[PDB]
């Protein structure tokens with residue numbers, strides 16, 4: 001329950017909850033780990049038209065399809081990588097390497113930042129495409145962005161981001177080709193990269209980690225659930241230690257098992 | 264597997280992006296499927312004739328380059344062309360005919376105008392489905408648009424008039440966006456949208472509309488966006504025959520009355536959004552209460568609240584006695 005206290009090193013992933021089946025194959029959904037109330041944020045992926053964030057006040061309202069409000073965003077969005085963090089939405093602005101910060105209480109853009117040298121707009125997406133080139137992540141250490149650069153030969157680059165000034169605080173080059181990954185997420189400043197089968201590499205697992213505290217990386221093999229064969233989003237929540245997943249129209253949550261932490 | 268020494272090549276994906284290129288380098292392999300040429304200084308003279316022979320290229324990303332005319336010498340079978348943020352002014356039949364299989368054309372943030380598009384330019388573009396012309400120099404909707412177009416975006420142009428022939432025979436069009444142009448009710452031609460049998464969505468947001476348009480197509484229309492206009496009134500036939508309409512939105516408009524029965528034909532109106540409208544609540548609006556009390560459970564209506572008179576300003580219309 002403490003979103004700033006490291007739960008350890010991830011050892012296992014388990015299907016936990018199946019909520020419902022969206023009308024869109026891909027999208028993302030999440031909760032805000034710095035928000036006391038049980039609000040849910042929802043953004044289906046619609047090519048060339050993704051410009052809204054929907055908010056639900058409970059899981060029941062979410063499953064019933066009963067929004068509390070819809071936010072009309074000031075720009076269109078590329079991909080499924082948005083997060084909500086202390087009452088602000090962060091998203092990749094369509095056909096840019098920029099992150100926009102949009103305050104939900106006032107519905108005004110409060111910041112924008114360039115993610116230096118990031119590939120964008122279906123240049124280094126995750127394997128399914130969808131302009132998923134730039135992926136935001138929140139964890140116990142703060143706000144991150146997961147992307148690729150040509151300086152790093154298309155392999156994943158991680159930056160830590162200041163959530164109020166939107167300035168990059170640190171950058172790490174990984175060894176993992178971003179387009180080969182299905183998705184990825186951060187826990188305790190460690191990047192976990194998912195490989196999985198798509199309906200149209202026979203393994204479903206986390207096969208690589210990059211530890212930003214140590215700047216050290218390694219191969220791993222943690223089985224990763226993939227019932228529907230179309231993972232479009234994987235978002236970790238440090239408040240409840242769950243994964244918020246969008247897989248082949250299915251909105252589901254995965255529980256996690258941890259062992260002693262790394263440095 | 265050759266690769267230009269300046270680029271990176273991986274399994275058909277050719278990364279020549281963001282590399283200070285003024286011309287496409289020699290050495291792109293013949294199994295190339297996707298050309299990333301964006302964020303360079305490539306102009307038309309920079310595209311070599313050999314490029315036409317990259318027979319497997321399906322997608323070319325050339326956004327944010329220095330093209331001032333529609334690119335020529337393109338791979339013959341290309342399906343998706345991303346040309347945003349160039350200085351393209353003119354489109355010719357020769358350039359379009361040379362890529363007959365094109366399905367998706369993004370021309371956002373260029374300087375194309377109606378006169379710049381050669382007559383009959385699109386005659387051989389028999390597979391074109393998606394055409395984005397946002398932020399161009401269009402004053403009217405070009406004539407001769409391919410009959411196969413499914414999505415047409417003309418937002419943030421300076422469109423003032425729409426001729427019936429320009430949309431005539433666009434029977435496959437389902438999504439039309441005209442947001443942020445200079446359209447008046449006067450500018451809309453008589454029955455201009457009437458024959459858009461397949462039209463699903465019509466967006467006129469942030470135009471200068473004063474009255475809801477009429478003679479809209481009902482055969483297929485499911486979404487109609489009129490928000491952020493200054494629409495003072497709804498002509499009695501503005502929503503006639505809209506039997507498939509799913510969502511209708513006239514938020515942010517100067518609506519004070521709704522004449523009885525304007526929604527009579529809305530058999531499928533699931534989401535009706537009428538917020539941010541100055542609803543005068545008098546005799547003429549009594550029907551609303553009853554219509555909303557008899558409103559079916561599935562239908563979701565929002566935004567109806569009184570602003571005048573002062574006495575009942577801010578009070579929900581479906582609750583007031585008189």
Ligand SMILES: *[C@@H]1O[C@H](CO)[C@@H](O)[C@H](O)[C@H]1NC(C)=O
Nearest residue numbers: 410411434435436437460461
């Ligand atoms: C109009 O839409 C329908 C959708 O069922 C499609 O079958 C038809 O082909 C479209 N019109 C034309 C001329 O293709």
Ligand SMILES: *[C@@H]1O[C@H](CO)[C@@H](O)[C@H](O)[C@H]1NC(C)=O
Nearest residue numbers: 506507508529530531532561
């Ligand atoms: C929608 O209109 C059709 C006629 O086109 C009608 O059959 C149907 O009942 C309407 N929908 C509802 C929910 O009544």
Ligand code: NA
Nearest residue numbers: 002003005007
């Ligand atoms: Na914790």
Ligand code: NA
Nearest residue numbers: 081082135136
């Ligand atoms: Na994300």
Ligand code: NA
Nearest residue numbers: 135184185234
């Ligand atoms: Na992710």
